[PDB]
């Protein structure tokens, strides 16, 4: 009875398709977990700079998010967002770098608005180690730092973090990779 045979093959095909997708999503979940940090410090490694720069220039992929990082095991959940070809007043001329508060499982227990000092950095891979960076005290009246209602608050940071020329002509890029670092002050709490 081939109709029966075909129906079962079809069910199996569909279930194999679902499993193949769950498997790929778990691979992603592993990477996220393996690169998580719980002391308020993020190191974000961005490979294939050239291709990714070009995808932002072409408007295919304007921005990238880091993996999440945390101020503590059950603390604020955060990430970074970078625009390789720049955003706002830095579009086309700069790399723009922003900080992001994400909805965390424990937000009901944490102080809001978010008020930890944040430091944004681009790492120098040259032997001089002249890292680019700046820090800010979050503005309490910015919606960037409100208790999250959606998955992610609006990003906040530096549209003109570094000129693209400075970036590309220095020692920040090596083996077609850059390293971004974010430091959130945690000494303040709990």
């Amino acid at each position: 009875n081939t109709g029966l045979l075909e129906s079962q093959l079809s069910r199996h095909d569909q279930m194999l398709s679902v499993h193949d997708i769950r498997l790929a999503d778990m691979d992603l979940r592993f990477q996220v977990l393996e690169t998580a940090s719980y002391n308020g410090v993020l190191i974000w490694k961005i490979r294939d700079y050239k291709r990714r720069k070009q995808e932002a220039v072409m408007g295919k992929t304007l921005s990238l998010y880091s993996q999440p990082f945390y101020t503590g095991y059950f603390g604020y959940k955060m990430c970074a967002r970078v625009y390789l070809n720049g955003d706002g007043m830095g579009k086309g001329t700069h790399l723009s770098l922003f900080f992001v508060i994400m909805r965390g499982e424990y937000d009901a227990l944490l102080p809001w608005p978010f008020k930890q000092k944040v430091t944004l950095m681009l790492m120098d891979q040259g032997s001089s180690r002249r890292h680019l960076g700046d820090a800010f005290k979050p503005d309490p009246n910015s919606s960037s730092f409100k208790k999250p209602t959606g998955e992610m608050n609006i990003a906040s940071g530096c549209p003109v973090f570094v000129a693209q020329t400075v970036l590309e002509n220095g020692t920040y890029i090596k083996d077609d990779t850059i390293f971004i670092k974010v430091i959130v002050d945690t000494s303040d709490l709990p």
Binding site: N153, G157, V160, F161
Partner: peptide, 14 residues
């Protein structure tokens, strides 16, 4: 380094 005034990126989260 020219970030004396931290501002939001242009619009959209998620």
């Amino acid at each position: 380094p020219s970030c004396p005034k931290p501002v939001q990126d242009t619009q959209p989260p998620e």
